[PDB]
Ligand binder design. Sequence first.
Ligand SMILES: CCCCCNC(=O)[C@H](Cc1ccc(OCC(=O)O)c(C(=O)O)c1)NC(=O)[C@H](Cc1ccccc1)NC(=O)CCC(=O)O
Length: 297
Amino acid sequence: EMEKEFEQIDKSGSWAAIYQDIRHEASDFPCRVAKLPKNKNRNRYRDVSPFDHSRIKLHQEDNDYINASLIKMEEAQRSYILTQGPLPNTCGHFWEMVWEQKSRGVVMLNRVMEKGSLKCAQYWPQKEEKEMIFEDTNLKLTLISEDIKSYYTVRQLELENLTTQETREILHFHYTTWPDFGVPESPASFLNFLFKVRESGSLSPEHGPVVVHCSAGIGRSGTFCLADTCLLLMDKRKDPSSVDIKKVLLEMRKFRMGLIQTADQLRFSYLAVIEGAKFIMGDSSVQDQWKELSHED
Ligand SMILES: CCCCCNC(=O)[C@H](Cc1ccc(OCC(=O)O)c(C(=O)O)c1)NC(=O)[C@H](Cc1ccccc1)NC(=O)CCC(=O)O
């Protein structure tokens, strides 16, 4: 029982040893293509790479590499693509992947600059009259509208393949207040945002996997996925309390290394998931409380 485990861990002061244990047991799979010298310019960090077995392959004959991994949750029936924050030369690759995987949504949980340091390129357009063209991938991206909230912004984007001329609506969900190596301000804020992502349709199985990213594509992004996936499980078990969060995280760590970067992010996923279960269980008003508590305005 989740809650029961959570308290025992908390009362026993064991978040760090439980977290170190997860790291110690995570899967070790090769990241050979990501390490090829010619892809060094495609990697934001030297110690963060996609496993060979689950990486996303660009459909270029030229060079199919993108530091991105397909996290496929069989029991939850949900797939996610987790990627680092694109670099100046991978903005086209990033959009080529969104297009090739049929993603309808993009979840960004970092800010372009954090602590004065640069974490991701400005890969989408900031003004509607200033659209972006990715020459290398023959794509055009246009900002269609944006809804700014106090800690997040939802943007409506139009991605066009210039080769075939088809256009697609891409929703972009941007969490602007999640510190690096940190946790959202509260479970309510987190959940209010996640439920926004779920209600947009983006995560539906008739579309490609949603794209999640932060600067490395592992801490913040792992956190968001573990809570989303645990909640889906709690809603399909009907013995919701048997969802074992450590086990779900180790399953996801088989597809991408380092998911969840601090013990505190692990502990927050437990708080988020337990608070989110109120909704699963049947509380028809906890959602409006999260919106109120999140202070969207
Ligand atoms: C899994 C192992 C990584 C843990 C230690 N590594 C780091 O902090 C980062 C990777 C990283 C991981 C999670 C993050 O999100 C946190 C979140 O979302 O909560 C962020 C992030 O957002 O900042 C950054 N890598 C380096 O700094 C390398 C360390 C290094 C340096 C030299 C050789 C080998 C490793 N430097 C770089 O890669 C510099 C770039 C270069 O030289 O190409």
